[PDB]
Design a protein around this nucleic acid. Sequence first.
DNA 1: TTTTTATAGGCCAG
DNA 2: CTGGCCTATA
Lengths: 362, 365, 364, 334, 333
Amino acid sequence: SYQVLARKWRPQTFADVVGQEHVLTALANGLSLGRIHHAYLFSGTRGVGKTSIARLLAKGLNCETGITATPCGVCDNCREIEQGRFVDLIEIDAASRTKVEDTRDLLDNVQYAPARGRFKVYLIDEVHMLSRHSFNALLKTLEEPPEHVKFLLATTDPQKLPVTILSRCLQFHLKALDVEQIRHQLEHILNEEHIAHEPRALQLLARAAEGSLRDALSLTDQAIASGDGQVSTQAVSAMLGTLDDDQALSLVEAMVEANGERVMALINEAAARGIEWEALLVEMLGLLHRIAMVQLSPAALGNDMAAIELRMRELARTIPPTDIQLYYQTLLIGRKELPYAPDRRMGVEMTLLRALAFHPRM
Amino acid sequence: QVLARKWRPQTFADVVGQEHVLTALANGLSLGRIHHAYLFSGTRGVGKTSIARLLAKGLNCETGITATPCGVCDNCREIEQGRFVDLIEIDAASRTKVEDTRDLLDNVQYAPARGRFKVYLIDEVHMLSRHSFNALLKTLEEPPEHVKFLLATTDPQKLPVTILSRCLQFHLKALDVEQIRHQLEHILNEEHIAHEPRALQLLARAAEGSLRDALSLTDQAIASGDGQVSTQAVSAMLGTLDDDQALSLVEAMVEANGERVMALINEAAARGIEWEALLVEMLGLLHRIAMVQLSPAALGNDMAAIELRMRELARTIPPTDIQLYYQTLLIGRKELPYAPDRRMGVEMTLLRALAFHPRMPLPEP
Amino acid sequence: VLARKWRPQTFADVVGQEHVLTALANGLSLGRIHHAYLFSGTRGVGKTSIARLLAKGLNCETGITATPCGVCDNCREIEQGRFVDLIEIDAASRTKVEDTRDLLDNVQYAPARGRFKVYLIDEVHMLSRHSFNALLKTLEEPPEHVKFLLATTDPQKLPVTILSRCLQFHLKALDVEQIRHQLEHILNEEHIAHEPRALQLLARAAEGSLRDALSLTDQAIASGDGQVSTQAVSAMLGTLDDDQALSLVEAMVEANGERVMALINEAAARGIEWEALLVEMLGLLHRIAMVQLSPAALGNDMAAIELRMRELARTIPPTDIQLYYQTLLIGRKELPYAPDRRMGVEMTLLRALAFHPRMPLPEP
Amino acid sequence: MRWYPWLRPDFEKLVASYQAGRGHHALLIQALPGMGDDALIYALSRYLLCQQPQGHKSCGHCRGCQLMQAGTHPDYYTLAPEKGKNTLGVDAVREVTEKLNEHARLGGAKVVWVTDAALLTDAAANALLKTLEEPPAETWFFLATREPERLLATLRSRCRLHYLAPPPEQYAVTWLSREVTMSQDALLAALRLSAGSPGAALALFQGDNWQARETLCQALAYSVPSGDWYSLLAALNHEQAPARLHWLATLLMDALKRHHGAAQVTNVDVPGLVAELANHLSPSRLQAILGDVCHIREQLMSVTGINRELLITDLLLRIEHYLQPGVVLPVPHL
Amino acid sequence: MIRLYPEQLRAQLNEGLRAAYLLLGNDPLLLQESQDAVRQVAAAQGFEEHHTFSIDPNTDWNAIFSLCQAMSLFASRQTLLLLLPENGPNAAINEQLLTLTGLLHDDLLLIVRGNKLSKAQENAAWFTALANRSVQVTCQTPEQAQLPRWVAARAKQLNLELDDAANQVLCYCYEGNLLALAQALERLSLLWPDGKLTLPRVEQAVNDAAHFTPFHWVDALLMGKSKRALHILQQLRLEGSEPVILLRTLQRELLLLVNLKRQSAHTPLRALFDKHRVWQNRRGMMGEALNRLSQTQLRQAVQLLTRTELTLKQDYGQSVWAELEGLSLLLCH
DNA sequence: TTTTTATAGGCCAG
DNA sequence: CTGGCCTATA
Ligand SMILES: Nc1ncnc2c1ncn2[C@@H]1O[C@H](COP(=O)(O)OP(=O)(O)O)[C@@H](O)[C@H]1O
Ligand SMILES: Nc1ncnc2c1ncn2[C@@H]1O[C@H](COP(=O)(O)OP(=O)(O)O)[C@@H](O)[C@H]1O
Ligand SMILES: Nc1ncnc2c1ncn2[C@@H]1O[C@H](COP(=O)(O)OP(=O)(O)O)[C@@H](O)[C@H]1O
Ligand code: BEF
Ligand code: BEF
Ligand code: BEF
Ligand SMILES: [Mg+2]
Ligand SMILES: [Mg+2]
Ligand SMILES: [Mg+2]
Ligand SMILES: [Zn+2]
Ligand SMILES: [Zn+2]
Ligand SMILES: [Zn+2]
Ligand SMILES: [Zn+2]
């Protein structure tokens, strides 16, 4: 009965959900106060618990124990939803059933009372994909449903919904999950599974999650395969393509010394080593940032940099604020435009070359 | 239960704004000059679907065709509960096809079961096929005495000129910040719900003109704040921070003082205020300011607690300069996705301000 | 309703359109009746109204005439609705072939009251391929007692093979004075108070259509409580303004920042999509920069907006026009990053204003 | 579709997890073209579909393996693009997602091989999302791309990544020398043109292709000195233009590297043509031209239906303009 | 085979009917009118039974075996019509026709409708041994040159008296839409029984409705007439032409200009036109263009064409029509 | 001598 | 209810 963690560890009671404490609060608050709306719209970037929470709200509505905000998970009704078998939670793949002719069926079967539940709850997910004509068909029902109907909509991307559809819903925007928020969670999960792990490797994984729990659980699962059983600092950092601190700065330095031959030749030993290019660009953005900062107050350089700190300050004292802004700017634009250039390499080479020929003013 | 829906006005008295529409309908009912095709247009949530029904209700009141329907006679209450045999509410967006419009037509000839008029109210009317608009044409130009058409839609332009020419177009305007506030208050009072006066200004504003958008927003304010519509609750929910700390950074930035910019940010950062969010309230302030230059009266009604200081800023800084700051804070936003760390990105964008500062550039070597 | 009441029942009664009436008139008069006529032009200019007059003049009890009497059994019978041998088909709702095949199975039987069986087919563009083919079989071999009057807004849609069997009359948009005159007439007969300029404002707003006109008036009469005042009509037309983007360009060039920021407020009422306003503006600036290179660059299209435009073109610097244009395009590129799409358009015009070349923005 | 030797370890690592049953149900493999991703997958596919598997191996004699061998095996879905086309449409995905709910027509596991995830239409990628997050059981997906970052946000997060890094240059050149007989410099260049992947390298020698590079170089060697770049039309205006535009791009870049006296170049084998670019073009214009040449390449690959001749023609006329003194040169945006 | 213009037809159908009436052309009006002029004179010669038959490559080898059989003696005279495919007589129907060429009676009268033929299509056996028997009518519409004559001609056949200046103002409004020009007169003779069409009289009874093809526009750009261009666009819009088709045809020529303007410094003009196979009638026009346009205007032309193509197919923009209104003026300096 | 493409909604004849 | 056909939006 195996399943990826990303899938197994879906929160099955409100309690088990990480963060989003502002959404959970409003929800539980209204479930208790009796202020239950008819159309909730949940939004936010990939894997931050949009559709996990829809599914939980649904349990809370239908639970054999009462309309609760703390649903049990131990009635025919909560287990049935956990497994998708529950009949009064009509879950719709919007991205797949986009056509009007299809959502007009949806509507023709709304009037009818629920089977074994208390509410018929439609869960339209990936909802931003419904045809223009489909959205408009919902307009009148979404605004005035039967007393026994709740509409739970979720999408990555609510920009796309007609403003008339928004007007009609409560909109909960889920925040991205905090770096620590993700790490604590990774910790908890690797402990329950009984899997060995090294603190600082979870650190790289929360960063790399780029704000998303699924992204992160999917990375972790990748760690466990390449690592052979363990999630070690060693392994993760090889898989993620992380940087040993020198090589980054060295490039920053040679770049502002207008030293072409070396920047190029430095990238080349880096291509040998198999460095992940977006990661180079990013550490370079980070250094350029320190520097620019320290030029502000001497104190803003970290405890963390001790090894570099000597080379940092010099760069700060030499290079004018103005000229560092252009460097950062130029390498920012380059990261953006990276995945479009014919190789990843070639795009770092074009980007550095560009910034290279800055050095002299007039 | 749900506000948005509960407070649908049940008489013309209860409708906010739209004087120019209400006054016409009213003047026309008692004047006995009543068209056969009324078209209602305007943004989401401004009262077209409900004015249409009020009109219907008044056209059919047992007391007589009147602009003040009585809300009690079988006919009135039955239209309020949407089960009146002679008000045919057609969801244009599902009867879009011709073969559907054709059925509607075939049954126009037959007279009304209970009322003076058979009233078809075709809502979301811009969705009808090209084919079924034309179907509507001759019937909409020369109906039978006992028929009236109430068309309503979000955008009129999608409708054939041939239709437009055939009916009265009442375009409802979006509601002013004041008008929204006043309602949101009346309701929250009537519904017995504690509220802080500013939380309403804040809500009426984020409504972006739409009275539903407003009520929908309050509905979840009440939930977010726990039975209370409080300022902390609303601005929490709205991404707004309470307004000093945003301005303070602007100020600090025009005054070229670095320490304070950086400190004010460190403080933004122990609060975990959202980074894109911040840069926005600032372009927001930078705009209102450049705005105030131009026309003096322009400065908003919501920033009383801050006006002393804002007014000042407009007077003391050159417009060319202000466009500069905005500019820089904007590309700053454009950049934020791509910058290494959302914070660093904001920090770095403010350092660009400083480095290219007009009046006191950062120190060259 | 005024639209319905004042539909002309006599040729005298029809406004303008004189190059159609005179050719009809004369053809009746001098025995030249084609087996089939087609009436085109824009919404509300008399297409179907004249179709119905032709039917009266074609069947009058006095005889085939250009001056039908409007009084005989046959003429009031048609005026009313129910004339046995005037078969008026609403082709937009009877478009399938099954229905056109049946319509025409009765074409062959002789007419039971007047000289002519007259089939009046309205909004005829809507008929299927197949219903056309069938219609055509009957116009290729027209019975003698039958005449066909085909009416439509979009003739471009009938088969080449049907237009080739119809004398087609194109009705002109009615002119400002022509419409203003009929406005005055009618309002007077109904006994209704009106100011001169209130009417001239209505005719201008009608955009060439005598229906859009009477429809605008009925509504007027309401807003003014039985009076058609300039104080009232002015108001109600501001309710209905397409206008805000041409108007913002006029307002922007003239440096008028109150009028500029007021129009932006008029635009929020109408409930505009903001990226949309910007793009209509850019598009006018373009259109104008070209009526700089030749006169012929203004549309058959433009007409109502038109007068304002040629003037805008004259009284502006072509080096300036590419200046405003740069700023607008950039404001668009910036607009999804501006904090409120409103604020975005506001700050874009405000930027147009501070960097105005001609009359620039006051500095401290 | 061939099997290259550098796949062994990557395969032995990937099967393993499957051989335990803890294999992830949605593998996205990122590999250069010609790195042999399709074969790595076929091997994983065949192993999943075989009922009598001898370890890592598929046997050949079980009913499952027979059917597989002969194209039709009811539980193997190939998601590539219509013959005439270059995108992978939504409707195609929907067949596959529905049929997947039928209990395996041959009572086994079901595998779906999406050949190039990059080709998934916007609508297609989304239709793929909900099935991909939690498919039925014993369902296995395999997607492959060049560049995962060009791939829909939310689809990327349902997958486990596997990187198919190419073998050291030295191995790859020694690999090549045994498949084609070409100069050492030649291989090395082919190999470097192809971002490191042998066989994608090797592909160049097999076609009309390498003869076409020589033709691009012939022309280029004329346009540079004389300043007639509209003259490249001929060598660039082909259906393979995105590819040859990349050739052109890499030459421009090597020239820019020499103006900074760099060690590696990409076009090792024409160091003549490289030097002559470094000679008659300023760094400023070398770079601007590198700029537009990539930029058009994108549009030529990305904008559906766009006219090549017209787009390449604009580029060439426009380059000639940059060549002039004092013209304003392009600078990346946003 | 007596070749004719549709005007001349009425006369050579009186003299003698001939076994085979061939109506080739493109203009919808000159087809119908010719068609009907024959049908009319055939009834009047004893002909009751009129059979029509549209020929696709669809018509089976069973559909063409009910046509060859469709003529046996003695039946009251019958008029067999045949309509044609885009391509004209394919190798499939080049033979079916051959069957009908020898079954010719005074009883069976053939009428054939379609486009002009390719030259080896006309010279395909059946058609030449039809030759001394058949009449053939040219129904190609007249162009901006040949047109006024055709109007001042029909003007007289309807005995109306047209003015040098009214003739101009009709040819402007109805160019390429002969059917509407035709009713233009019919409508003006009902207007004025005088039969005198002064300019100002005709002005008031006209509406603008020309049909052009994209070609007409590039022609007009090539020669630098810009007021013409602009008209041609606005008509091409209200007909709903896919703007893509405009782009691709302005390009065949705009890129060809680019390429000639270069070589024009090395080799003479006359050699280049030959090198490229430039249709002879186009060749004068071209030179005109090559002369007025700089090698730089041509370049801005190309750039601008490109920006509008990207704006169309990438950005999904609306601008397209007005970007061409501009591109149209640039090529006219 | 006459043209982008992927997805969608829709009308009609028989 | 299919296969031919038009159209709108991005
Ligand atoms: N807030 C959260 N708390 C715990 N797990 C989470 C959270 N958000 C996402 N996840 C993890 O991500 C997986 C997918 O979450 P999901 O709710 O489907 O995200 P989405 O909003 O993108 O549909 C879950 O199975 C769970 O493991
Ligand atoms: N003018 C108004 N007065 C009072 N409430 C309004 C008004 N306009 C909108 N609303 C609120 O919005 C809800 C729905 O309004 P509705 O009339 O459906 O807007 P629409 O024009 O978009 O259909 C109403 O129940 C009411 O609470
Ligand atoms: N030439 C005209 N003279 C008088 N009234 C007109 C004229 N044209 C339009 N109208 C008015 O518009 C109403 C509808 O006119 P109609 O002739 O049906 O327009 P259509 O051409 O669109 O069918 C008529 O009742 C009449 O009041
Ligand atoms: F992956 Be989630 F539904 F954005
Ligand atoms: F909600 Be409304 F009818 F746009
Ligand atoms: F009756 Be019309 F064509 F508007
Ligand atoms: Mg989801
Ligand atoms: Mg509504
Ligand atoms: Mg009509
Ligand atoms: Zn429970
Ligand atoms: Zn009542
Ligand atoms: Zn009479
Ligand atoms: Zn096997």
